[PDB]
């Protein structure tokens, strides 16, 4: 499935992004408030 | 057969007395009278004063008597009248029996099962309803069991009695005769340290024990009327916790709350939360919130209704996690 | 093989604790030289309090049955033991009662309505008026004993000419705290009066099952302090024994253990189903003559100090006061979580400050 | 002046005995002998036997004595020779004095301070070094203080004695004379329920108490060589916790661990972890892990060094959180 | 004003507990009536064991100062109290000792190296051989008393002609568990022998600060069981008293409390304790003439049953055995965390199964 700390998950939700379609650049594919930002981005 | 929780307990005790002649039952007013809540009624008549007997009014002596008997090959099943009186026998329990096997490197052991009622909602006098399970949950060498149904009680108690180490069996006052359930006749066992799912759910995980399991079921039933599917997990043993079952439920739902009748600074809820965070943090959609009582001494009888946590508090907390 | 004289030992210690009696079942003085100096009015008020307390028990049992009271431990039969002992105390004396020793703290200054609030379970019921020297009824059997050794020591250190009096039952004598309490008071030579109310039962458990000691008063021997066994159904014997222990105490000679031999006519408690837990039907019938009110009534009537009209007036005074107290209790405002929070500490710790705010929001909406 | 922790303890007591006539010190061998660790040395000689005295050997009786003396206006400061003997006096502590203000609705109060040593590292016999702070921390109505330095010990003890409610003051055996520290002369207090920063850090929050503070500081100094900036927080009161300070540090670092000498199922680390996971779950970048002792009975003397958590365990766990 | 005979009560009761003595300070028989039946070979053996134990103490203290032993509570001076009491027991009897009663359990079957391991702090020291009926020394004063009552009840229930015997000091008599222990055994008429070793001190605390009771043996009155005060420096007296109590207990007559009046020459423990902070020199020299070894040596010599040749042989045999025991303890493998985990439960719970793997990993290196 997917993996991200809760702060992240809640950033993605607040922002109407479905974190599940974002590519994390973290250990094991963990998505970071950094990937969501580069998504909100293009 | 349809049995109440106290009936299933009495049946379980009768099964052990019959099965194992080493099993002894003793404490304040448990013999001829059959106990304060009739949990031992008829047992002395069937097995004799040599197997089921009354003792002098002293919890510490009752604890030492159990330890001494265990050293002589017996399987002691003493009773502390109300868990609030545990303060009188904390040494025998925590400083002694919980440590015997360790203390003697296996040379001696304590196949002891301590039965004791607790829990509120019945307007009992002072120090009768207090939840002090969180104390004994902190002592290595003990297993603490808290059933919520007649079926769990019978099976768990039988397991507790057969278990060759000290087991504290906590019986909630409000659950003794609150309802009936189909309980198989004859002996059967339920593993200690194993939780079960009282209600399958997919949106939120509700962890609870004791009388809070029913409250969690009521809340879940109400949440469902709004499309909120709650999974209610009954711990059934609070030490050791069933990590595999807890984490499994939390990982599936992504949201979780822990509900206990004990004060926030007490109980075992903090331990559950800490374990969930440690093992399933990156599966959490929100923080694991706790439903617990105010950090005051257990309330004077009249104030139970407003002080004790209930299904409405579980609903409110559950929705707070859903909307986080 | 050599034999120690243990049977002799047991017999010799027994001889040191004979039953202290002043009035027999017929109200006759059987011990004239132990007679306490009480005036006619004092004698009349003691009887007034015993009759009052008897009525208090009837009404308490009834109200509890009507759901208008909560936890209650019947007292009928122990009037001499409970009331005549308290009648020997002074305002400055400090009482540490058990769960069944409510009548004592009431006569010592605790309003009746507050005693009813204790039964129901309301914090206000335990808010003893300032200047009144009592603790709320202790449910932990034996705890009042070690705390008593502490209170008595406090009085001693302050130089106060007062005593700490505490009560427990036959069953409670088996507790460690019972022993520790009387041993500490002895070691510190403290002004404490330890009273043991022996009715032969500790709920369902007879006294022979508590200990093999033939008397409970002899337990004072282990603490090295004097012990007295008295007819707990005799107001004069009880009063005289407590008076004698108080004088000894206020003179700095230490504590005393008093075993009162009595019998209760009611159930253990009103907590179900105790009120019908048994009960023995014939064992009670011969204790109907031993009733403290019976012998003390005859004792006063032969002295032309009592009459059935005077007794009826007391009963009427009790009933009226009992209804206004139960009524005053009903009017007391319900408990809020914030109330319970506010009484935990002088200064609330961080966790309570938060929760206080949480529960204030819930109590305002 | 430069004082050891025991010297600070004694100074604090000396100051209270002098400034407040109601202060009384009592317990087993605390008088002429001056305590087993000399914490009460010279006090009886200076203030008299009526204020500093020995008692018969009965912990429960000692607790009941403090309760009664408090009802007569005294400010009792009793001692329990080793906190492992707390099982003998649990009712007086948890079922009584902690509940008096509540039980009496404010009419009576318990200005009691119970001193008691604990902690391992000095090869004591059984039930001497056990960490049982987790039991009393679960009881509403009590405050539990555990200093790690002479300066803290003196200030917190003075505050403890002044506080009009029960405070349990735990003194770590190993820290009594481990090192000297500058301690101000005269009366000065330190707020109860207030933690402090032992080492200001930026990468991870190390939370500890007792002897684990030195192990944390020692560990932080080594983590610096590895480019890890660790902030050490000394709780200094474990009940209540200083939420403000704990959370502020975690909001800055985003990573935390809790270190205790007590068994994993005991202590107060779980409660600390549960509070962080709830209040700052939005500032967490890694799960809050715990450094604790194995879940066995306190180790036989010779097994202390391999059982007791130390600075190397804090190193290993801190790095585990950083590399998450 | 009426007065109760409190003084007469205290005197008469204490009078029922006179010091029991067989051999005086000079080795002279003062009570041939109570002389225990002991063959010349048994008399020798008892002396050998008392001499052996003296050397053990001397050797243990030395070893502790060398850092070879850990926790040690000296025994010198209590040889009669500890050894002669044990000399009256049988293999089947169960001993529940305290921290200072290591000698009793050694002679009852605990190998000397395991006794030293207990001192150091190794779980194997407590791994008592099967069939040896003892528990490791109890560190919680009083705990052994309530456990002893249970053990005694167990023996009684299985119908075994054996007794449970336990030991505590003067200080321990103030504990609640001490009183609950003797009371429970009395209530259940259990075969238990309760020994109170009164060496006058509870650490720094003199026995007068513990209680105002004239004797400690009289504390049995509280439980309703027989009590005996004996000269704890007299081997024959201690033996005789315990043998009688054993005979009485196996015959199903219940428990007995025995107070031995003894004295220890060493410090309370071997860590910090300094005797010169609470006791006098003109008090230590007195009990030196009362030394159990002295009077018994003269008693045996007058019978031509003892000599300095035999005594020196026992002394050297003791040293050689201490030598091998300390070596065997040093050779015991060190404890691993996995060892302590494995001995926690029969079948480990989840939390321990995990931790077991963690430390099993760490121990591999
Ligand atoms: C430490 C503790 N353990 C058990 C109980 C439970 C109990 C409440 S009442 C009672 C019987 C007491 O009999 P006693 O003869 O002592 O007193 P009396 O009622 O006047 O006949 C028990 C065992 C309590 N309250 N505390
Ligand atoms: C429940 C508890 N509280 C305090 C202590 C601490 C202690 C260990 S030894 C001792 C003195 C006891 O002297 P006693 O005369 O009883 O025995 P003896 O040493 O042979 O002279 C104390 C206070 C322990 N171990 N357990
Ligand atoms: K068991
Ligand atoms: K305080
Ligand atoms: Mg006790
Ligand atoms: Mg009774
Ligand atoms: Mg001693």
Residue numbers in the entry:
A (entry chain I): 128 to 169
B (entry chain D), D (entry chain B): 1 to 324
C (entry chain A), E (entry chain C): 4 to 368
Could you pull the original sentences from the published paper?
We have also solved the structure of the E1p/E2p-PSBD complex with bound 2-(1-hydroxyethyl)-3-deazaThDP at 2.5 Å resolution, representing an analog of the postdecarboxylation enamine-ThDP intermediate. Crystal structures were also determined for the E1p active-site mutant with an interesting catalytic defect: I206α to A. Although crystals were also obtained of the mutants H128β to N and H128β to Q, these were lacking the cofactor and so are not presented here; however, they do corroborate the location of the PSBD (see below). I206α contacts the thiazolium ring of the ThDP cofactor. The crystal structure of the mutant in which this residue is replaced with alanine reveals changes in the hydration pattern within the active-site pocket, with water molecules now closer to the thiazole group of the cofactor. This mutant has much greater DCPIP activity than the wild-type enzyme, which might be attributed to the greater access to the pocket. In contrast to the boost in DCPIP activity, this mutant showed impaired PDH complex activity, in which the rate of reductive acetylation is the rate-limiting step (Fries et al., 2003b). The crystal structure of the complex of 3-deazaThDP with the G. stearothermophilus E1p I206Aα mutant reveals that active-site loops (residues α204–209 and α268–290) are ordered. The differences between the DCPIP and PDH assay activities for these mutants might reflect their differing roles in the first and the second steps of catalysis. Both the I206Aα and H271Aα mutants might provide greater access to the active site, but both might cause inappropriate conformations of the outer loop, so that it no longer engages the lipoyl domain for acyl transfer.
